[PDB]
Design a protein around this ligand. Structure first.
Ligand code: NA
Ligand code: NA
Lengths: 270, 269
C-alpha cells in the first residue's frame, strides 16, 4: 500500500483525502492518501520524515507552497514559473520532483464547462500566488490576451512582467478597467473589488476560485451584472487533484463524477 | 452512496483504518468512504464539528483525542462512560452524536479468535492508563480467574481496580510485587521496557502487546527471551475494534480474516 498525503490545510475542513481515495477506488490503485499534520517545527522536517518513512507523494497547501518549492530537488516548468509547489513526488532515484497543478486544474475545469479559451480575452483578478500559479497554464491555451488586475497597479505589473515572454499579458489597476472580457477569473480571497461591472458582457463567463453552498459573493455580483455563466472553484479543486494523481500514478481518473459528489455534500449530503 | 467516515488522531502517520473499512464495506455491501485525517493537537473539536457539518456519519478517534471525544459526544454508551474515553463517534438519526468505545471489545474478540482461553485464566494487565481502562471491563466479562492491574505509578492501578470491582476478580499490584507467572500478560503501555521481574513469563504464558509493527515489538521480544508460550501483537486488536465500530455504524458485523492476513503481509513487506 503506497502512501500519499496532503500537508497543511488553510481551512477547517479536508477534501483532498476524500477526492484521492475515490480516484484510487476508480482506478483500483493500492494506495492510501491521508491528511498529515505539519508539526510545530515545520513543513520541511515533516516532508523529510514523510519521504524517509516510505511516502511516495504529497500535496502541499498554502502557506507552505514556497517552502515545498525550495524542498524539491527538481521542478516542473509550471512549478518553476509559479514559484510554488503544491505536489511533491518521489522519483525512482529518490529525487523529489516538485509540480504545481493548480493552474492546469483550473484550465481543465474551464474546458469541462465548455469555456472557449483559445483566442479569448481573459481578465485575471488578483496578482498574488493564486494568480501567479495559473498564468502559464492559461497562456498555454492560446488566449488572445490576459489582463492582470489588482487594487494597486504595481503588483499586477510585476506579475505581467514575469510572464511577458509567454503571450500577450497586460496589467491594469481595478480603477482603469473599462471594457468587457470573455473570461473573468477571480483569484482573490474574500474581503467586492472596486471594479466597473462593465467587465461583464452578454457572453462573458465568470470563474471564481472560491466555492461554497449556493453562489459565492463574487459570483452573485457577476450574475447581478449580467454574466452569461458563473462557475465556482469546486471543479478546480478536483481538477488540480486529478493532475496530481496522474503525475503520481500515470492514470487519469474520473473528475466529473467526484465533483458531483462533492457538490452533493456541500448542498447537505442528503 | 459514499457515506463519510474517518479516523482523527495525531500523528496517525501510517494508518491502516482506511484499508480495513474499505474492505469491510465491500464485503458487506455498504457504500461508504473512510479517510485518515491528522488534526493538530489543539484542533480536534473544530475538526469533528466540521466533519459532521459537512455530512460525516461517523469517525474513529485515536490518541491523543479520546478523552476530548468523550466530552464532545452528546451521549455516551455505558462502556464508553466506564472507559472514560471515546474511540468511536456516530451521528444518529436524531442529530445527536453518540460516543462509544470499541477498543476493549476489539481486544477481547482478537484474543478469543486467536484461541487464547480467557475463561479461568490469570491475567496480568500492564499499565493503568486510558488504554488499560478501556479494556478492563470487557476482559472481566470473560470470567477470568483474576485480573491483576499494575502500573509504573501504583496509585493509578489501585484507582482502576476500584473502578471495576463489581465486574469480577481484580487486584492492583506494584511492579515490584509481581513474583509469579500468569496465563495471559497484556501490555497496554505505548525500547524502555517496564521494570518488572521476568518471572511473570512462564513457558505456558500467552503475551499480548497492544503495540504492533514489523517484526517483534520490544515488549514481545522481551517476553520471547523469557520463554513465553506465544507472543501476539496488537494488529488484531486494531482490526477487531474496527469491526465493532463498523457494526455500530452500519448494523452488521464484518469478517476480519482477509484484512488481518493482508495487513500482516504488508507490515512485513
Ligand atoms: Na482499472
Ligand atoms: Na458531551
Amino acid at each position: 500500500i503506497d502512501q500519499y498525503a496532503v500537508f497543511g490545510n488553510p481551512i477547517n475542513h479536508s477534501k483532498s483525502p476524500f477526492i484521492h481515495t475515490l480516484f484510487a477506488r476508480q482506478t483500483q490503485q493500492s494506495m492510501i492518501y491521508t491528511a498529515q499534520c505539519v508539526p510545530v517545527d515545520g513543513f520541511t522536517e515533516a516532508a523529510k520524515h514523510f519521504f524517509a518513512q516510505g511516502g511516495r507523494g504529497c500535496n502541499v497547501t498554502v502557506p507552505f507552497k514556497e517552502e515545498a518549492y525550495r524542498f524539491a530537488d527538481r521542478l516542473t516548468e509550471r512549478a518553476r514559473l509559479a514559484g510554488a509547489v503544491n505536489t511533491l513526488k518521489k522519483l525512482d532515484d529518490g529525487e523529489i520532483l516538485g509540480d504545481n497543478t493548480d493552474g492546469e486544474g483550473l484550465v481543465q475545469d474551464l474546458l469541462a464547462q465548455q469555456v472557449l479559451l483559445k483566442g479569448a480575452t481573459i481578465l485575471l483578478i488578483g496578482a498574488g500566488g493564486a494568480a501567479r500559479g495559473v498564468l502559464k497554464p492559461l497562456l498555454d491555451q492560446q488566449p488572445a490576451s490576459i489582463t492582470v488586475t489588482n487594487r494597486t497597479f504595481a503588483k499586477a505589473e510585476q506579475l505581467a512582467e514575469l510572464v511577458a515572454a509567454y503571450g500577450e499579458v497586460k496589467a491594469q489597476a481595478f480603477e482603469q478597467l473599462k471594457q468587457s472580457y470573455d473570461v473573468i477569473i477571480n483569484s482573490t480571497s474574500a474581503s467586492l473589488p472596486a471594479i466597473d461591472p462593465v467587465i461583464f458582457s452578454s457572453r462573458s463567463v465568470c470563474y471564481d476560485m472560491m466555492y461554497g453552498k449556493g453562489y459565492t459573493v463574487f459570483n452573485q455580483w457577476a450574475r447581478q451584472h449580467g454574466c452569461a455563466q458563473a462557475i465556482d472553484g469546486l471543479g478546480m479543486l478536483v481538477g488540480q487533484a486529478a493532475e496530481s494523481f496522474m503525475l503520481w500514478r500515470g492514470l487519469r481518473p474520473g473528475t466529473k463524477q467526484i465533483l458531483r459528489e462533492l457538490r452533493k455534500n456541500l448542498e447537505g449530503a442528503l
